[PDB]
Amino acid sequence: FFNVVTAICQLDKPHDYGYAIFTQLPDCTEIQFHLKNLPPGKHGCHIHKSGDRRNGCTSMGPHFNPFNLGDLGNIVVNNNGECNEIICVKYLPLTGSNQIIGRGLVIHEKEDDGDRIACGIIAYLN
Amino acid sequence: YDFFNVVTAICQLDKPHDYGYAIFTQLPDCTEIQFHLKNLPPGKHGCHIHKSGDRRNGCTSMGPHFNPFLGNIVVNNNGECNEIICVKYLPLTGSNQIIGRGLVIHEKEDDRIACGIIAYLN
């Protein structure tokens, strides 16, 4: 595969919870999590509309759902507070008119069947 | 007059400490940049877009100057910068967009004393 777009999100609010790598593959947007210091268990993982974090994770606004699918589903954090799982999401563009680069990745307290316990801006890796 | 479908970006310059933020507004003839910086050394400071949004190693991780193919800001004696500039070619969207990339404040006019990721205000 040439010539891949890669993004990084440091989940560093409200504290250092590590980071995630997004890789725009042709069938798939691959997400490699490298989270740490989190509560163990399932946590809802969502793209949020705004990259603004002036009020912490609250400023990142609502779920990003441009077409009326920023829903990545649940991640699982291990008992040591880490998450190194990998998922691949169809139709999660990094570039172009509905891109998630420049927007927000938020880890939610509750699982998808609540409050925002970790968030970061999705940015170009290079 | 009346601009619709404006794209607006925010950059919080919050490493290595809180130095405020800047707002980018892409207008049809230029990109407006409204600075709201604080706690900085008075004097002129170089201001540049850098290619990477990575800040794992601080502002160093944001890499080299970005090729979209800003000049100096003045910090006052209060340590604040509230000026507005307009940059004729500075896209926030498209393949050469600066959203997702870095804004770095340099201590020398045209070490990185402040940086942030340029994001959708949206």
TrEMBL record, chain A:
InterPro entries in the record: SOD-like_Cu/Zn_dom_sf (IPR036423), SOD_Cu/Zn_/chaperone (IPR024134), SOD_Cu/Zn_BS (IPR018152), SOD_Cu_Zn_dom (IPR001424)
Database matches in PROSITE patterns: SOD_CU_ZN_2 (PS00332)
Gene Ontology MF term list: copper ion binding
Listed GO biological process terms: superoxide metabolic process
UniProt-listed CDD domains: Cu-Zn_Superoxide_Dismutase
Disulfide bridge positions per record: C28-C88, C57-C119
Residues covered by the Superoxide dismutase copper/zinc binding domain: 18-122
The protein, known as: Superoxide dismutase Cu-Zn
Source organism (scientific name): Megavirus chiliensis
Taxon lineage: Viruses, Varidnaviria, Bamfordvirae, Nucleocytoviricota, Megaviricetes
Gene name of the record: mchi_272
From TrEMBL, chain B:
Domain annotation Superoxide dismutase copper/zinc binding: ranges: 20-118
InterPro entries: SOD-like_Cu/Zn_dom_sf (IPR036423), SOD_Cu/Zn_/chaperone (IPR024134), SOD_Cu/Zn_BS (IPR018152), SOD_Cu_Zn_dom (IPR001424)
Chain's gene name: mchi_272
Disulphide connectivity of cysteines: C30-C86, C59-C115
Biological process annotations from GO: superoxide metabolic process
UniProt superkingdom: Viruses
Transmembrane annotation, as ranges: none
One MF term in the entry's GO annotations: copper ion binding
PANTHER family, A to Z: SUPEROXIDE DISMUTASE CU-ZN -RELATED
Protein name, UniProt field: Superoxide dismutase Cu-Zn
